[PDB]
Symmetry: D2
Subunit: 121 residues, 4 copies
């Protein structure tokens, strides 16, 4: 729990997430995707439960990446919600929402949903 | 535009969202929920597209609130993903995910999904 | 109650849902979408809780529409999950998932999520 | 594509899905869960694209199970949306929504979301 969130994590697609978990609940770092109209690292900011469990529970957290950096602007943002589980093999299990900025007409189809599992391997 | 988003907003459940959009695409503020095992304000951080498109397209954004403050700890976090639409009645239309910390056993039922629409009142 | 649900319903996009709730918990009917690469009516099948609770609780249900008929084939399917609420203004509030068939490569972006509310007009 | 959907599939949790895919798009069978206020088989009905791909694509399908049978009535329903991929190892990849019948007050928290992968192993 706590500390263990800090580090470099990779998801199945090969995207890399580098985060720092602050003692009070903050999450900061950068994200490099393997898919999308992405190119390079993007800033990410989030929050986690800095006082999780004491039943054998994971630590809830979530973070956002707006897909705009100095090289690309996909006009979209992704949010990941999930929980961290530490152990010999620690992982972050998430479900995400990716919303693109659309005109009203296309608003009905602006959000994609998926899931990603991140490991430090 | 950072400004347009900056302000106080309320959603249909009666929750309060106080946000400041910064020049670099950052979002910070506090959230007061009308529902849940929540009590008082919680800190929120997010990001938005500071350079949207020059048409009548919304501005994509998202933010997170971990439901822990000095009064309560719900051991859960919510992320909202959606878009800001300006005009006379500016709105933020979102879809959210609420994940609770759980044992490996109940992980299958750790996440709730819903949608919220916010109406702006103040800057 | 099977009846309450049986009827013609429309959602905020202007789509039509014609459904019959059968005694065993089955749902069958046709759906006419106002959006997408859809054209005409499509067959729908679903299930609902034929024995809900005896309080002011909604009736959970869900249905699917594969977007293929004799005129079009969009290679995608949508499932709606939500609840039926009776009264004078009966509504079906739902959240939906629209999955498109894709190559392994773009599978990450195969599913869209949204919400729809239906208002009843006819039985 | 087509035919291959018919069979017994199992998901990570150990739930078993037995389906029959009809030549015209129908899906019928039963579902036995490993989790939830479940007990036994429940009927399921769905639809699939009976004319998928010809790029190497999966077959979109979806189905519903209302959690009521002769033994239990959880007053909930689950819908799975996803696509089928055949091959030496065929699988059905899904994201699901589980809605419980609530009073209005609790409507905001009536739906759970997750994902499941099914194999014939």
């Amino acid at each position: 729990a706590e500390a263990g969130i800090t580090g470099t994590w990779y998801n199945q697609l090969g995207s890399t997430f580098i985060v720092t978990a602050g003692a009070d609940g903050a999450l900061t770092g950068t994200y490099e995707s393997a898919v999308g109209n992405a190119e390079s690292r993007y800033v990410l900011t989030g929050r986690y439960d800095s006082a999780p469990a004491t039943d054998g529970s994971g630590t809830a957290l979530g973070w956002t990446v707006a897909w705009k950096n100095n090289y690309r602007n996909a006009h979209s943002a992704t949010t990941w919600s999930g929980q961290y589980v530490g152990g010999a093999e620690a992982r972050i299990n998430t479900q995400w929402l990716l919303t693109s900025g659309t005109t009203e007409a296309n608003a009905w189809k602006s959000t994609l949903v998926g899931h990603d599992t991140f490991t430090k391997v």
